[PDB]
């Protein structure tokens with residue numbers, strides 16, 4: 001059940017689709033970016049259509065929706081990426097096994113594109129082109145992280161296997177989220193931009 | 196969606212079911228185990244009914260069954276572990292981020308053995324304070340595999356000029372595989388827990 005707004009893939013399972021500037025989808029994603037990165041120039045925005053990653057992600061979403069016995073498990077966040085990792089992420093998504101890991105050994109996502117836009121996360125390539133994903137993340141129920149976590153903490157130490165879904169730097173006002181499991185993050189758009 | 200031979204879980208997502216000796220299900224696992232561990236005695240065999248793990252695993256199997264060319268992508272393998280790890284594995288499966296370094300490393304992933312005798316080593320199935328050893332019997336998506344290397348954090352590419360098109364798993368020896376390493380969540384379903392003693 002591949003989303004309606006995806007465009008036909010001629011029976012293929014992976015496609016990157018360049019969005020048309022000035023149409024609704026492009027304008028929505030651009031506005032999420034320019035909220036904090038209005039000094040940056042957008043060269044292009046690509047929709048990531050990865051059927052297998054989507055399938056695996058949607059399964060985890062339906063599971064977290066049952067487990068948490070409410071919705072609102074999903075946030076739209078940013079991930080800066082070096083050019084050399086874009087093909088792997090487009091195909092395979094985010095892998096904790098591949099910077100500061102102060103809040104645990106998981107994959108990091110920023111609330112603000114400005115954070116992911118730092119050269120440390122979105123390293124300029126030969127031509128000064130920077131790369132950042134807009135990511136559907138299953139943040140679910142979250143707590144403050146700490147160094148050395150390999151999974152989120154338990155919600156209550158009396159049930160050590162019933163875990164928080166993610167961790168953050170700050171629970172009242174989060175600026176980053178860490179997830180510790182494959183298929184808790186779906187890379188939805190890739191933004192190619194310059195300083 | 197859940198297999199029809201599973202006991203009714205009411206509306207529950209998790210259950211361990213104690214098997215009865217004389218049942219074909221118990222006897223096939225005991226025989227698989229005793230093939231290489233006839234020195235040990237089985238206390239009990241539990242069927243693991245974990246709906247969420249089962250769902251995510253079956254999705255990965257369907258994807259690998261589509262991607263690969265009529266391959267048998269699944270092997271039934273062994274995994275020894277310590278008592279302290281059993282409640283987490285039962286609920287959340289095998290986490291590569293928790294995995295011990297193997298005496299012979301073919302990569303940084305989760306290790307599964309062809310032979311129960313390998314998993315039965317005290318290094319993997321550590322005797323608990325009561326002298327009970329624990330070994331999972333695990334459906335593993337081995338898929339298309341190659342000989343691993345200690346540096347790996349993901350399976351290697353099949354083709355060095357196509358770095359994102361990966362082997363599904365790695366092994367110690369492609370001619371005579373005795374262990375498999377997987378590097379992704381939901382590539383292994385813990386199906387049975389064997390509790391055993393000397």
Ligand SMILES: NC(=O)c1ccc(OCc2cncs2)cc1
Nearest residue numbers: 079080100101102108110116121
């Ligand atoms: N790739 C990214 O966009 C990215 C990477 C790392 C991020 O946080 C790392 C930190 C850990 N402790 C404090 S900062 C945020 C975003």
